[PDB]
Write a protein that binds this DNA or RNA. Structure first.
Lengths: 141, 108, 52, 36, 146, 150
RNA sequence: CGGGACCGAGGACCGCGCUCUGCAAGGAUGCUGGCGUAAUGGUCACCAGCGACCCGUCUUGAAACACGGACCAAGGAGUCAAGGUUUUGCGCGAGUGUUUGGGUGUAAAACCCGCACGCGUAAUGAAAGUGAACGUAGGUGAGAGCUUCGGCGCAUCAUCGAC
RNA sequence: UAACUGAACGUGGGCGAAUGUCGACACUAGUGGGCCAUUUUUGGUAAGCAGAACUGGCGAUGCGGGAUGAACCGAA
């Protein structure tokens, strides 16, 4: 973050109850600042007020988790891209499953991890392999 | 019994103000609620009253004879006129007796 | 009451797999390769193989 | 350190009183609408 | 060596009542040879202790008899208790382990019928058209101190 | 019977097809890279003493709670990271058809109602896996070897 | 296709099967010999091979140190009363508790009886005092069971209300 | 909100990575500033060493191997 003027698209972001927000504390604005802890933490919006929002954080104490409700101004909250990979995906499954059910052919609709690659053929022409020693010969020069 | 004990199993492995001369008989004031008021009537006469065989007669209940000094007003009463003779009565119990159709009479 | 090995007791093998008798009769473990003269190795392959 | 259980409906106890009062009036209205 | 739990519920009653043992045998047979879950629930409640079987009062039965439950057979694996605050007992068919004398008298005076669990097994072996009720478990001074 | 005949034919055709692809690439003056293995067989060969908690948890999730325990595992990146973590306790590699069929014929036990039942009849396999199309021991072997949808 | 070792669990039939008059197919039978007793087996004493520090207690994280032990027989150390608390069994149940006492008796037993009283059924406040239904004893989401298959919904839990 | 323009909550209708496979009470405990070691880290010493974090072991534990043995290896 650069010193001086704060960008003004911070005030033009609309937060609603249930939205997932990060907490990135701006040093320039001292009003509405949370604790030293709860900075860099991700939480859920439960209350929306004129210049601040309420964030649900789960703090840890001893061997248990305690729900904390933190009132943070719009200066220090940022929309979290954790569930964009969920919303875009669930929309994409919605139209793809509608199209696949209309067409008739079943599809694999769950994301799959990296499978081993299949067999393929590599041509030698114009890509002749070069022979390497354990050390470079121009280096031994 | 000694034989059922754990020792026999372990055989081998071992504010406010003060009230001087308080007489508890001054504050003897037991209370009965109106939902238990009809239980003081004997069972046969109670069933006659609740079934309506008695329409020209109203029961009179002395709470002091059964051992109660105050009539409290938790519960409901049927629409039968009852004379209740009591040392104390609450406002809600008195109210509920009057929409029941009876009367609360103060005694000493 | 007793688990019997299909690789040793052939009756359990034919119980679990009725195709075992056909396999043994038709000798499907001794299938020879397809006929035809095999092409020789390309010279570039041997040159790359024996390149220093 | 297991994650604690979360209630299905959080209380309106945390929210601002103006929106809480409006939400209670809306709940009474949808209650009478459902009863009708 | 390999890098790797008994049950925590009753399987037999701790009581030595011979009649209770007969009831346990009958409902064990019923729960084994029938598909109804009612028999299994009644057997599990027959296994239980007294503090796990709080009494059920006549006013508690009359509360649950409302809303189209008037002709259902009330089943309570506990003692059915009389309430003086209930002036008019509705007509009810109740099957229970025990009835207090005044509760049984008031039921039979109101015109209902009192049954035991063997009679319930004979008349309704699958528990059809039955209302299975329990009393307040947490209504003890012991529980209030917990 | 017909299904086992089809499976034997498919195994032979796959073997000769891999050999044929390698030969035609060699004759055209190129190199055929074969497909990376999809099936691995993991054997735990180290004991249960003095083991760190994360390898212990991964060895628990791989159902390797005893020395000389073996499991058939599908090769994927998400599993391969776990196997890479528990490498100091296991030996793994790519099994062949004789390995698979000998293992399931000799030490083939199924989990039926939480019980270890020997695979002595096809009725057990049809009862516990018939909804997936696996009705006999040859379908079980084929699914394990070819890494099917089930 | 041979050579060897260890094992024979179960006890009418059922089942999966095959090479289908039968079988190596959900666990050993058939033939034969000697002996019919200390022969097998067992107990004790001793030799042989291998293994094997003296028990308590204390210490601390532990060992050592320290302490006790000549041997034998008998005796020898978490008991009873009162008052709480949780759980198990039982009787009665909005009540419950005969046994202070009285009556009676085959006489310290058993049987019977009731007034009072204790606890419970109402709480709250220092006290004076006051004292628990707007509603099928409320609404919402669960919830076993039941259902005419529309729903009713015990216990209990979360929440919003009422006195 | 200029606006059924939004905000929540309902009414009705339609439809998702791998691998493996419990919760709440009641009552009663013993131990809760011990030893050793790997790894990481902070201070030092002439050399020693002193501290912290995680993990494993021991105290509570037999067995095979280190000729022998609290801390080693294998294995419970």
């Amino acid at each position: 973050r650069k010193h001086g003027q704060i960008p003004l698209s911070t005030y033009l972001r609309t937060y609603r109850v249930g939205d997932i927000v990060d907490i990135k504390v701006n040093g320039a604005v001292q009003k509405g600042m949370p604790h030293k802890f709860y900075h860099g933490k991700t939480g859920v919006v439960y209350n929306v007020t004129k210049s601040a929002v309420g964030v649900i954080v789960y703090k840890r104490v001893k061997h248990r988790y305690i729900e904390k409700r933190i009132n943070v101004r719009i200066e220090h909250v940022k929309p979290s891209r954790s569930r964009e990979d969920f919303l875009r995906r669930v929309k994409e499954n919605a139209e793809l499953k509608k199209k696949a059910k209309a067409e008739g052919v079943p599809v694999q609709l769950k994301r799959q991890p990296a499978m081993p690659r299949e067999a393929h053929t590599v041509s030698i022409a114009d890509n002749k392999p070069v022979t390497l020693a354990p050390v470079a010969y121009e280096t031994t020069i | 019994p000694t034989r059922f004990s754990k020792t026999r199993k372990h055989r081998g492995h071992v504010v406010g103000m003060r009230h001087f001369h308080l007489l508890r008989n001054h504050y003897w004031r037991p209370s009965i609620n109106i939902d238990k008021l009809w239980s003081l009537v004997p069972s046969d006469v109670r069933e006659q009253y609740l079934s309506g065989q008695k329409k020209d007669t109203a029961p009179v209940i002395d709470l002091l004879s059964h051992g109660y000094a105050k009539l409290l007003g938790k519960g409901r009463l049927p629409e039968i006129p009852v004379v209740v003779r009591a040392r104390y009565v609450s406002a809600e119990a008195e109210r509920k007796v009057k929409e029941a159709g009876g009367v609360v009479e103060l005694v000493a | 009451v007793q688990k019997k090995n299909p690789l040793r007791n052939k009756q359990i093998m034919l119980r679990l797999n009725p195709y075992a008798s056909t396999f043994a009769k038709e000798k499907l473990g001794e299938v020879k390769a397809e006929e035809g003269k095999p092409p020789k190795v390309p010279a570039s392959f041997k040159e790359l193989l024996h390149e220093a | 350190i297991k994650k604690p259980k979360t209630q299905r409906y959080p209380s309106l106890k945390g929210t601002d009183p103006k929106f809480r009062r409006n939400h209670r009036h809306a709940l009474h209205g949808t209650a009478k609408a459902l009863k009708e | 060596g390999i890098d790797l739990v008994r049950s925590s519920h009753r399987k037999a009653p701790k009581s030595d009542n011979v009649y209770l043992k007969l009831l346990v045998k009958l409902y064990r047979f019923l729960a084994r040879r029938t598909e109804a879950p009612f028999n299994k629930v009644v057997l599990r409640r027959l296994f239980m202790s007294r503090i796990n079987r709080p009494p059920v009062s006549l006013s508690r039965i009359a509360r649950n008899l409302k809303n189209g439950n008037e002709k259902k057979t009330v089943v309570v694996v506990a003692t059915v208790t009389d309430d003086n605050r209930l002036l008019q007992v509705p007509k009810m068919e109740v099957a229970a382990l025990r009835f207090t004398a005044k509760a049984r008298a008031r039921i039979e005076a109101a015109g209902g019928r009192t049954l035991t669990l063997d009679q319930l097994a004979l008349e309704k072996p699958t528990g059809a058209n039955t209302l299975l009720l329990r009393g307040p478990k947490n209504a003890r001074e012991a529980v209030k101190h917990f | 019977f017909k299904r086992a005949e089809k499976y034997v034919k498919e195994y032979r055709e796959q073997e000769r097809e891999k050999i044929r692809l390698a030969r035609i690439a060699k004759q055209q003056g190129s190199f055929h890279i074969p497909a990376e293995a999809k099936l691995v067989f993991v054997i735990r060969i180290k004991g249960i003493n003095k083991i760190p908690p994360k390898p212990r948890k991964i060895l628990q999730l791989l159902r390797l709670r005893q020395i000389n325990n073996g499991v058939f595992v599908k090769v994927t990146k998400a599993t391969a990271e776990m196997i890479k973590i528990v490498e100091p306790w296991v030996a793994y590699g790519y099994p062949n058809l004789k390995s698979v069929r000998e293992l399931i014929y000799k030490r083939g036990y199924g989990k039926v109602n939480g019980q270890r039942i020997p695979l002595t009849d096809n009725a057990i396999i049809e009862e516990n896996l018939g909804k997936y199309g696996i009705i006999c021991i040859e379908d079980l072997i084929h699914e394990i070897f070819t890494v099917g949808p089930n």
